[PDB]
Amino acid sequence: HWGYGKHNGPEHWHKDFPIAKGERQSPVDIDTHTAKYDPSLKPLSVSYDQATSLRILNNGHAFNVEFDDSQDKAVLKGGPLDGTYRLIQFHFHWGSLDGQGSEHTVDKKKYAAELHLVHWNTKYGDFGKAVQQPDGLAVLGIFLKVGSAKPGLQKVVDVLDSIKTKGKSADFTNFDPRGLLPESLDYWTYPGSLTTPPLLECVTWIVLKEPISVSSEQVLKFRKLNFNGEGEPEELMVDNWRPAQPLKNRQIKASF
Numbered sequence: 001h002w003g004y005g006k007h008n009g010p011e012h013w014h015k016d017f018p019i020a021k022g023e024r025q026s027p028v029d030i031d032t033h034t035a036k037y038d039p040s041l042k043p044l045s046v047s048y049d050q051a052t053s054l055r056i057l058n059n060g061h062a063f064n065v066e067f068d069d070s071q072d073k074a075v076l077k078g079g080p081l082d083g084t085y086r087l088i089q090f091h092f093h094w095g096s097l098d099g100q101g102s103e104h105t106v107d108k109k110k111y112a113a114e115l116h117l118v119h120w121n122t123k124y125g126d127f128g129k130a131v132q133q134p135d136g137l138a139v140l141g142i143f144l145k146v147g148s149a150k151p152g153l154q155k156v157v158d159v160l161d162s163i164k165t166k167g168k169s170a171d172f173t174n175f176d177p178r179g180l181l182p183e184s185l186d187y188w189t190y191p192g193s194l195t196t197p198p199l200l201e202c203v204t205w206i207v208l209k210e211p212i213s214v215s216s217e218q219v220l221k222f223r224k225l226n227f228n229g230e231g232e233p234e235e236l237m238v239d240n241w242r243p244a245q246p247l248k249n250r251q252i253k254a255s256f
């Protein structure tokens with residue numbers, strides 16, 4: 001099945017998932033000089049105060065931190081969004097070196113990592129219904145560069161021994177994602193897709209401009225993670241990112 005190597009990487013995905021060459025695929029490069037300020041954009045609202053993390057899972061691609069979304073607790077509203085989007089999970093893509101890792105790039109600049117917090121539109125009742133919908137998902141993208149440590153990321157980092165290999169999960173309750181926001185909510189927004197198969201074209205992207213900085217020692221632990229399952233050849237989980245995909249004259253709008 002799909003992965004990030006020579007034989008199962010992003011260049012092979014189109015075979016099982018034709019939509020991989022669709023009209024609103026992700027990620028894209030954000031050309032800061034072509035993006036336009038959008039006055040019709042509402043203020044963005046990220047309410048993560050009542051968020052309830054359940055568990056952390058190595059899925060053979062990333063780790064997902066998973067949330068109980070049976071209630072209307074952690075939510076994205078505002079911005080390009082209409083109505084309410086519920087937080088279901090978060091995860092990252094990172095590099096083998098600090099000069100690669102992000103999925104979205106800024107004027108072709110690659111950051112060491114990118115965080116995606118994934119939300120479903122509550123008019124659709126479940127997540128599964130939402131992904132049959134053009135406005136089904138909202139993902140909130142955040143860049144990571146290597147500098148001073150992010151204290152709010154340290155609980156994720158320390159638990160990663162728990163979930164070394166494909167399959168493993170760890171109980172992961174009371175994690176606060178608020179610890180992972182940068183101070184500014186300035187952002188670019190376009191309609192796009194999941195960046196992993198099935199690459200469903202269901203996402204309003206809200207990519208934050210200000211990146212968070214994490215330590216060299218922090219990103220280093222992500223890199224110790226395994227692609228393989230327990231007792232298999234060691235493939236370090238590095239470079240689990242998709243490259244920028246053709247814009248196809250969508251317009252990227254700026255909140256600033």
Ligand SMILES: NS(=O)(=O)c1nnc(NS(=O)(=O)c2cccc(C(=O)OCCCCO[N+](=O)[O-])c2)s1
Nearest residue numbers: 026088089116117118127139193194195196197198
């Ligand atoms: N990087 S990204 O653009 O944000 C994503 N790339 N992939 C993402 N997946 S997910 O939205 O988060 C997610 C969430 C909760 C449960 C599940 C889940 O366990 O169900 C499988 C989802 C359909 C794929 O399988 N399939 O047979 O079609 C998945 S999000």
Ligand SMILES: [Hg+2]
Nearest residue numbers: 133134201202
């Ligand atoms: Hg869709």
Ligand SMILES: [Zn+2]
Nearest residue numbers: 091092116195
């Ligand atoms: Zn992602």
